[PDB]
Structure 1
Amino acid sequence: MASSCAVQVKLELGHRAQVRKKPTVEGFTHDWMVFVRGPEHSNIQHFVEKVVFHLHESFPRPKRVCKDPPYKVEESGYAGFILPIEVYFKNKEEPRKVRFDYDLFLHLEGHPPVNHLRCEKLTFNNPTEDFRRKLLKA
């Protein structure tokens, strides 16, 4: 074994938020949608087991898991927050996952809707053969 391999994949993290016309009963003022995907519709399912979106404690059932695309959550509330996103790979070893602190921000009323995209590069050094294969079918 001399041959070394480095694999990169691109994730995208992003979200939409817009002002409701009529606030909800809880006084939710905004509707929003956060998600994770690969670019140009790449099958990230090949190497992603699951994604967990950690909503703020103010949310009931805050820890939201998607095992299958689309990796997203659609919700209503009243303010933005730091939104930890855990992406879990189909990997027998390190890294088993990765954490991002996703700035889920809203805009005030009178301002345009949020439409935010955060591109993220992951690098893997000398994954197993199995994981290298899933990574690269993606």
Structure 2
Amino acid sequence: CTVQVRLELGHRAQLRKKPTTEGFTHDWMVFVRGPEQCDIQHFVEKVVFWLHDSFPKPRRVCKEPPYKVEESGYAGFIMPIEVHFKNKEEPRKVCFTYDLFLNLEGKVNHLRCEKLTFNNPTTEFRYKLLRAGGVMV
């Protein structure tokens, strides 16, 4: 028994008409979502976004959708992202290192698809997966 499920990581970034008081030139938003008509909440406990030091409260947690962070700033950066599962056995989470890159001349619309694979899920975990659009192989 093996179920595969699809995650979408992505971000949008726009240059601001006029900057902020601190000289923040960009507004951006980073997210974890399922593909069209898949609610990943059925198996995702929470998403952890590890923001850069310069941010107040760098460890940003979303326990329910939308799994997202919206901030402003002047520069892009590398960002660890952790997706925790509603799962009482290993693996209980997965990590990606996300590059939030900015366009200094305009907008950025970026999407990135990751396919998780669960070998021999339990009876209760296996729907959480199938409820969320999972597929058996």
TM-score band by shorter chain is over 0.9
Aligned: 1:50 with 2:68: no
Counterpart residue identity of residue 34, structure 1: V
Q: Distance in 1 between matches of 2:45 and 2:113?
A: 20
Corresponding position of 2:68: 72
Measured on the aligned residues, the alpha-carbon RMSD in Å equals: 0.8
1:124 has 2:118 as partner? yes
Residue deviations 1:65-111 (CA, integer Å, cap 9, x gap): 111111011110011101111000000111100000011000113xx
| Cα distance in structure 1, aligned partners of 2:37 and 2:26 | 28
From 12, 16, 20, the counterpart of 2:16: 20
Matched positions, count: 132
Higher relative contact order (CA 8 A, sep 6+): 2
Q: Does 1:63 align with 2:59?
A: yes
Structure 1 outlier segments of 4+, above 4 Å: none
Q: Which amino acid aligns with 2:84?
A: Y
TM-score by length of 1: 0.93
Residue 121 of structure 1 aligns to a residue whose secondary structure is strand
TM norm structure 2: 0.94
Task: Provide structure 1 residue ranges, at least 5 long, that are not aligned to the other structure.
Answer: none
> What percentage of residue pairs aligned between the two structures are identical?
83
- Aligned partner letter, 2:20: T
Deviation at 1:33, TM superposition (A): 0.5
Name the counterpart of 2:99. 103
Letter in 2 for 1:114: V
